[PDB]
Write a protein that binds this ligand. Structure first.
Ligand SMILES: Cc1c[nH]c(=O)[nH]c1=O
Length: 130
């Protein structure tokens, strides 16, 4: 229905805004674009499902997220990929893991404060009906 399409458009607007706020945070610069294979040649071999905030925006725009839960799975993926690819005690790895955890926690915190639970429940119910 057109009311349903209006719901999903509102979702997309909300998600772009959260994603923009994450993307402009200097701590998260490393997560804003896909990994450069020149710079990191084995990345695309080790990490099976690369994700980054530019790709998140492309997916919002492609109507691939019908719920905040689906969006959060991709935020989670950005984080788990970083924990998997940089697991060492070395300070570079530890820095990127900290930042990955901060990205995830920040996204969850924004969503906890700003997403109405009934809005999300509506999205989920429309999704389940299709
Ligand atoms: C996204 C990313 C970039 N560079 C790295 O060394 N590791 C990563 O996980």
């Amino acid at each position: 229905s057109m009311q349903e399409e209006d719901t999903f458009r509102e979702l997309r607007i909300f998600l772009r805004n959260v994603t923009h706020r994450l993307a402009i945070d200097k701590r998260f610069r490393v997560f804003t674009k896909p990994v450069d294979p020149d710079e990191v040649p084995d990345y695309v071999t080790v990490i099976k499902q690369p994700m980054d905030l530019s790709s998140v925006i492309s997916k919002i725009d492609l109507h691939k997220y019908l719920t905040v839960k689906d969006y959060l799975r991709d935020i989670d993926l950005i984080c788990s990929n970083a924990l998997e690819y940089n697991p060492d005690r070395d300070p570079g790895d530890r820095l990127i893991r900290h930042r990955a955890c901060a990205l995830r926690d920040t996204a969850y915190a924004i969503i906890k404060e700003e997403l109405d639970e009934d809005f999300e429940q509506l999205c989920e119910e429309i999704q389940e009906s299709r």
